[model samples]
Target: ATSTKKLHKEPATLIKAIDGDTVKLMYKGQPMTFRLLLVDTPETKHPKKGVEKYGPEASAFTKKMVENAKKIEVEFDKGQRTDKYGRGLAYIYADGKMVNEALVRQGLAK
Candidate 1:
């Protein structure tokens, strides 16, 4: 057979939005932290740094999106998995729309 591997995807329950580009989720009977793929929003909770401009706005946007979504799913990048902080790195989908993309589109993420 040809080498065409299926994408690994899984359903996850949104516990909450940690920040603009981070979320807490319940998956496979465990709570895990997920970092949105390719999305970098303002920092609101940095121990060594103060709040960045529009950080709260970005956080609010993510919270609303995650909390209001009817369904949420996550998919990982081919070889990349967890980040240095042990947070799962993936693209989060809300009602079939990519939240990561939405953040960038709205100018909330880089």
Candidate 2:
């Protein structure tokens, strides 16, 4: 089988952290929302439901990682680039460390 997957990596700066798995990034002079790939952290801002257990902690962890990084980058896996809400779907890297995996390692995400 021929694989037609292409990975795209782009430089970005953290604008803000939306939650544990979502963040706002400044990419190419534009503010873009990105949802971290392969990791689902506890919900902190659900409209219908209040903050879940450990949600605040997960959010703080993500914030610390992105905020303290010297360099931040976003990588898109092969396939769709944006989710239904038009947020970019990506794996975020902070100083070369994958944020998605870091959250999982820290037990902040599943």
Candidate 3:
């Protein structure tokens, strides 16, 4: 079924790229951690993890992308604010492009 979700977009600035699918940035006049919606990157850190495969490459890619971003923005889907981990659930745009979508396209995320 098609969903009529309310989308909210706002300005942001990249601070750190936690991984391919996650980032730390300033949004709406403040800094917050945001996990890109529907993007899953390799694990760099986990109590039960020992560096998942391709994690470093994913991180490096995100870091460089964010570092070179000319403009950043955040997009929120309907019924959303933050995820259960207290991280914002949204799509991050780097210089007018959706980072989440690009990651998936480039096989950096699942």
| C-alpha lDDT score of every prediction, in listed order | 0.62, 0.64, 0.62
lDDT (10s digit) by residue, model 1, range 1-110? 67544566788657777674556787676667775544343544553322344556667767877777737776653544455656565567777788767764655533
Tens digits of lDDT, candidate 2, 31-63: 677655444446545533223446557677677
The number of the candidate with the highest lDDT is 2
- Choose 1 or 3, whichever is better by TM-score: 1
Off by over 4 Å in 2: 1-3, 18-22, 35-52, 77-80, 83-85, 104-110
**lDDT, residue 64, model 3:** 70
**Residues 1-110 of candidate 3: C-alpha lDDT, one tens digit per residue:** 79796767777777777674556777665557765545344544432322343555656766776787637776665655555766565567877787667654665532
Give the C-alpha lDDT of model 2.
0.64
Ranking of all predicted structures according to TM-score, beginning with the best and ending with the worst: 1, 2, 3
Worst 10 residues of 3 by lDDT: 44-53
| C-alpha RMSD values across all candidates | 5.9, 5.8, 6.0
Query: TM-scores, in order shown?
Result: 0.61, 0.60, 0.58
